[PDB]
Design an enzyme around this catalytic site. Structure first.
Site, PDB file in Angstrom:
ATOM      1  CE  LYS D 122      16.873  -2.511 -90.621  1.00 17.58           C
ATOM      2  NZ  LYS D 122      16.798  -2.039 -89.205  1.00 17.58           N
ATOM      3  CG  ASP D 213       5.240  -5.762 -81.253  1.00 16.23           C
ATOM      4  OD1 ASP D 213       5.734  -6.857 -80.904  1.00 16.23           O
ATOM      5  OD2 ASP D 213       4.133  -5.663 -81.816  1.00 16.23           O
TER       6      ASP D 213
END
EC number: 2.7.11.1
Lengths: 48, 48, 670, 286
Positions: D122, D213
């Site tokens: 990432k 979320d």
């Protein structure tokens, strides 16, 4: 390098003249036979 | 006159890196150590 | 701290007087080796450089100008080595005249001298192929004080006006090789002869490094004593010059070998070799015990790709689940889609022509290989490596390989040469039982059968040289190597080439490399000697601890001198850490071009071969990098990416490397 | 974007010089030529200028000649390859190349190590480029942040990808043989998996976090066996996380739970019998 013993004096492209002569050459290389290249006096040019 | 003490590979950086092929020489009359350049010689095949 | 200085007249004068008194003392001490009454031995060797010239005559002149007819007459009868004491200057000269039919005998003669006289002809010009080589080779191996002298000058015109011409031309010829001197002396005149004699007597002879740091005895009398039926004791009566000898150290004798000492007596005490004896064995049995930790024993048989795992891809595993489909006659594809589960003059001439051709080929095309379609590239290079940077990656010295020589462990692994050299030379200086200027009986152990070759010490020079610690022990040595003048001929890196360093001569199949300094000490293996620059010759040979100059030659029977002088240089290093990688270049043509991907042709012929070399970088002599992508056809075509834009005039290439091992050396005689 | 390939074109020296520009742009704005010549600790114009030619050709550096003010500008690729070089040095990454996860402030590639164990990369791209100090700096801080959060998530037992390394704005993580709530069709024990996914939000609000979320694509599910069917509930959520003190933690938590129950209601037709955990119980639980 090694010039053999035979440097005993007693008993290729064209050469350049030495001394006075050489100067003469230059006097005509620059003043009797002038080479005006590109608005200047060019000494030692290749292709131009 | 001096006698070559040690072959020196000094490296002198800016603005141009000389792979300084130089020498430590000791002068005969003083017994005094000095560094010295050995010109025009790429390989130092001349000075041991 | 401490106050300053204000040196007065007196202080100055004194420091001066002390410096100079010290200088003078030291000079007297250094000029006491030739006390020409009892303890002196000035070796002068007479070397004519012209065929039609007599050395006996040159001596005759020098000693007839000493007004001693007896010492001349007594020498004509039968001798070649003389012990001449001059009373005029009070000096003990030793004159040596070489066998001028043996080149190496000339070299051996001069290389022991304190003085080298050169005979020059007024009639005959010095030979380019013989006498000149005498000059140069003497000059390279080492010369003490040299002189240029003539005898044939009277053979020209009787009037001096013409003789002086010859003289001066000779002076300018002689100055070329020997600029230290500017005066070629004429023996015809009494003055110059008296003067050269004068110099030989008085003048102190300079030092030749390697010979003076290990000691040497010129033998006057050599007798033999039987001890055992198969071996006895060579007795040698001679004066020691140089550093001196120790009973424990070995002694070399030219064209005989290295032997060990049994006893030494002085006649200016008795010393016998004890338990600290240097032994007569090359590969010390302690060398086997020093190389005990074998570090990398890599198995190139257990590889699916090129050894380059350090900078390459990852170990790809190809688990083969082969099942047999039984439709009669069916391609490998259908089968791949039925059982899929998921869970002597002629010889020399021909060979030499071929070597010239391969060398010039090696200049035009360096290290390139030509693979055939039938050739499985993998197998043919399976043992090789494929490092990205040859001077950055991690080659190692301690790797075990079937190609490595059996002896490789049993070698003398000096850590540091520069320091070991100094330490051992200081040891030898301190532990010297027999110093310079001593007359010595030397009792050496010696195998009987060689007594047949030993000549008479008066007709032939018999020199006795000293060896240092472990110098009999083989090691991995690097020589500096430079080509002899006017020698265009090719010299590959595996052919036998005799090497003279110190006084010792060993035939050597040396590996040539370029001594360019590397952070990982890894140097390209050059198949043929470089025609322009200094190179490096590495091999397994006995050590030398004084960095003797080395002469490289190949014995040629046809020439006058039975020696072809190939090259020269110096004993550089006793180092094993130097590894030599034989490079191997693969060549390929860049076939087709797309704005980022270039299709390359004729570098392989199988797709699996291309798989095998995937990780290995591609370099183009246009100076551009790249890598392979995937195999195009079933013919080995391969797609590739690169740094710049390449045309069909470029060559895509691979560099693969292999370990090259030094080779064993044997002494050379006769 | 990222073309990892080109990195194996550079030598010790080109990385040396690129590093020098990295020390020289974090000290001065636009690093001039002599700054790179003197800071690099090199020999001559040979090595440095050849190195910089390599970097500039391979788009790792840009030449800014502003009215006699000659200088250089490190692109994102340079930073990438310096983090990646730092990891090549720290023996953490050995090969790269397969893009699964194109986020807004994060790029997710598939990588490998010395041993052949698959992992994930990432990198963080804030603004993707008109490079100032803030883009690179805040991307660096972004991955620092997410790696620290990740380390605290692995440490405390949570089923969250184990953070291996945080080379600047780049982060090496564990590859997880999992499938998101979209790609998943049916489960052998849906109530147990719901119990798990609720107990997790409970323990997360017990730690002090509310991952605002918690949707379907967020939750990965790793399978360990095919005979016995072993599941593992991985969750990717860190910059969207919202602490348990913020004014708005309530409907965030209860949105997470309502989404858990609404998906478990639609896709697997499994409604929860016990009442959903409210924010208050978890406000006392921490």
């Amino acid at each position: 390098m090694a010039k053999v013993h035979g440097s005993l004096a007693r008993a290729e492209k064209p050469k350049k003249p030495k001394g006075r002569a050489y100067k003469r050459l230059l006097y005509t290389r620059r003043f009797v036979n002038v080479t005006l290249v590109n608005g200047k006096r060019r000494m030692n040019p290749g292709p131009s | 006159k001096g006698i070559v003490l040690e072959k020196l590979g000094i490296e002198s950086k800016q603005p141009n890196s000389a792979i300084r092929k130089c020498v430590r020489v000791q002068l005969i009359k003083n017994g005094k150590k000095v560094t010295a350049f050995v010109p025009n010689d790429g390989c130092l095949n001349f000075v041991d | 701290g401490k106050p300053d200085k204000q040196v007065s007249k007196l202080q100055r004068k004194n420091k001066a007087k002390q410096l100079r008194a010290q200088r003078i003392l030291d000079s007297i001490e250094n000029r006491k080796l030739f006390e020409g009454k009892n303890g002196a031995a000035k070796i002068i060797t007479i070397v004519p450089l012209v065929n039609d010239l007599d050395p006996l005559d040159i001596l005759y002149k020098l000693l007839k100008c000493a007004d001693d007819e007896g010492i001349m007459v007594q020498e004509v009868d039968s001798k070649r080595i003389f012990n001449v004491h001059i009373k005029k200057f009070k000096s003990n000269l030793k004159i040596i005249i070489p066998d001028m039919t043996n080149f190496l005998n000339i070299l051996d003669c001069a290389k022991v001298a304190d003085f080298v006289v050169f005979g020059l002809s007024g009639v005959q010009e010095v030979d380019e192929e013989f006498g000149e080589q005498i000059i140069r080779a003497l000059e390279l191996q080492g010369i003490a004080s040299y002189i240029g002298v003539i005898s044939n000058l009277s053979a020209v015109h009787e009037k001096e006006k013409f003789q002086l011409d010859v003289k001066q031309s000779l002076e300018s010829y002689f100055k070329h090789f020997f600029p230290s001197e500017e005066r070629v002396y004429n023996l015809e005149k009494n003055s110059d002869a008296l003067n050269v004699l004068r110099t030989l007597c008085q003048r102190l002879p300079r030092s030749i490094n390697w010979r003076d740091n290990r000691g040497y005895v010129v033998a006057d009398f050599v007798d033999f004593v039987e001890t055992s039926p198969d071996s006895g004791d060579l007795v040698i009566e001679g004066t020691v010059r140089g550093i001196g000898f120790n009973a424990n150290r070995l002694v070399h004798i030219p064209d005989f070998g290295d032997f060990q000492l049994n006893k030494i007596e002085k006649i200016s005490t008795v010393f016998e070799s004890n338990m600290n004896r240097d032994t007569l064995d090359e590969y010390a049995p302690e060398g086997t015990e020093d190389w005990s930790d074998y570090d990398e024993d890599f198995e190139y048989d257990g590889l699916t790709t090129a050894r380059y795992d350090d900078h390459g891809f990852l170990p790809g595993r190809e688990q083969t689940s082969k099942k047999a489909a039984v439709p009669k006659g069916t391609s490998d594809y259908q089968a791949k889609w039925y059982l899929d589960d998921v869970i002597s003059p002629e010889e020399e001439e021909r060979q030499l022509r071929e070597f010239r051709d391969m060398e010039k080929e090696d200049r035009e095309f360096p290290d390139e290989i030509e693979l055939e379609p039938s050739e499985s590239a993998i197998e043919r290079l399976k043992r090789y490596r494929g490092l990205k940077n040859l001077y950055n990656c991690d080659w190692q010295v301690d790797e075990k390989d079937p190609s490595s020589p059996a002896e490789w462990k049993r070698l003398l692994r000096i850590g540091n040469y520069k320091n070991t050299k100094n330490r051992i030379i200081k040891e030898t200086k301190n532990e010297a039982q027999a110093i310079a200027g001593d007359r010595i009986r030397m009792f050496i152990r010696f195998p009987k059968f060689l007594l047949e070759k030993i000549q008479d010490p008066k007709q032939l020079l018999f020199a006795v040289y000293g060896l240092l610690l472990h110098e009999h022990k083989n090691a991995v040595v690097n020589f500096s190597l430079q080509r002899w003048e006017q020698y265009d001929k090719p010299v590959p890196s595996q052919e036998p080439i005799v090497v003279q360093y110190g006084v010792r001569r060993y035939t050597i199949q040396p590996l040539f490399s370029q001594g360019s300094n590397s952070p990982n000490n890894v140097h390209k293996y050059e198949r043929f000697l470089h025609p322009d620059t200094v190179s490096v010759a590495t091999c397994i040979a006995p050590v030398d601890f004084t960095q003797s100059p080395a002469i490289f030659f190949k014995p040629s029977p046809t020439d006058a001198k039975n020696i072809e002088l190939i090259g020269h240089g110096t004993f550089l290093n006793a180092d094993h850490s130097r590894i030599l990688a034989k490079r191997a270049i693969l060549t390929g043509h860049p076939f087709r071009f797309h704005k980022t991907v270039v299709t390359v042709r004729y570098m392989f012929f199988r797709p699996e071969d291309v798989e095998w070399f995937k990780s290995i970088p591609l370099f183009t002599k246009s100076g551009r990098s790249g890598f392979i992508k995937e195999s195009l056809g079933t013919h080995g075509y391969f797609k590739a990416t690169f740094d710049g834009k390449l045309s069909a005039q470029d060559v895509v290439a691979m560099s693969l490397y292999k370990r090259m091992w030094p080779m064993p050396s044997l002494p050379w005689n006769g | 974007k990222l073309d990892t390939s080109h990195m194996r074109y550079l030598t010790t020296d080109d990385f040396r010089v690129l590093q020098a520009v990295e020390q020289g742009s974090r000290s001065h704005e636009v690093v001039p030529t002599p700054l790179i010549h003197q800071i690099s600790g090199m020999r001559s114009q040979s090595g440095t200028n050849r190195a910089i030619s390599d970097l500039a050709k391979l788009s790792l550096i840009s030449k800014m000649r502003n009215v006699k003010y000659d200088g250089y500008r490190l692109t994102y690729n340079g930073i990438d390859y310096l983090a990646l070089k730092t990891m090549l040095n720290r023996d953490t990454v050995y090969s790269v190349g397969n893009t699964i996860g194109v986020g807004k402030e994060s790029d997710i590639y598939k990588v490998s190590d010395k041993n052949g164990n698959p992992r994930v990369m990432k990198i963080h791209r804030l603004g993707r480029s008109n490079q100032g100090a803030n883009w690179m700096h805040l991307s660096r801080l972004a991955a620092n942040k997410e790696y620290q959060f990740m380390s605290m998530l692995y440490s405390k037992g949570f089923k969250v990808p184990e953070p291996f390394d945080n080379s600047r704005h780049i982060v090496v993580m564990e590859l997880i043989e999992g499938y998101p709530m979209r790609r998943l069709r049916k489960h052998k024990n849906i109530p147990k998996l719901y119990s798990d996914l609720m107990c997790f939000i409970v323990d997360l609000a017990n730690s002090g976090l509310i991952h605002c979320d918690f949707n379907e694509f967020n939750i990965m599910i790793k399978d360990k066996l095919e005979d016995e069917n072993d599941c593992g509930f991985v969750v990717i959520d860190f910059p969207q996380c919202i602490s348990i003190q913020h004014q708005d933690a309530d409907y965030y938590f209860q949105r997470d739970v309502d989404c858990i129950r609404r998906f478990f209601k639609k896709k697997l037709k499994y409604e929860p019998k016990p009442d959903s955990s409210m924010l208050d119980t978890e406000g006392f639980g921490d």
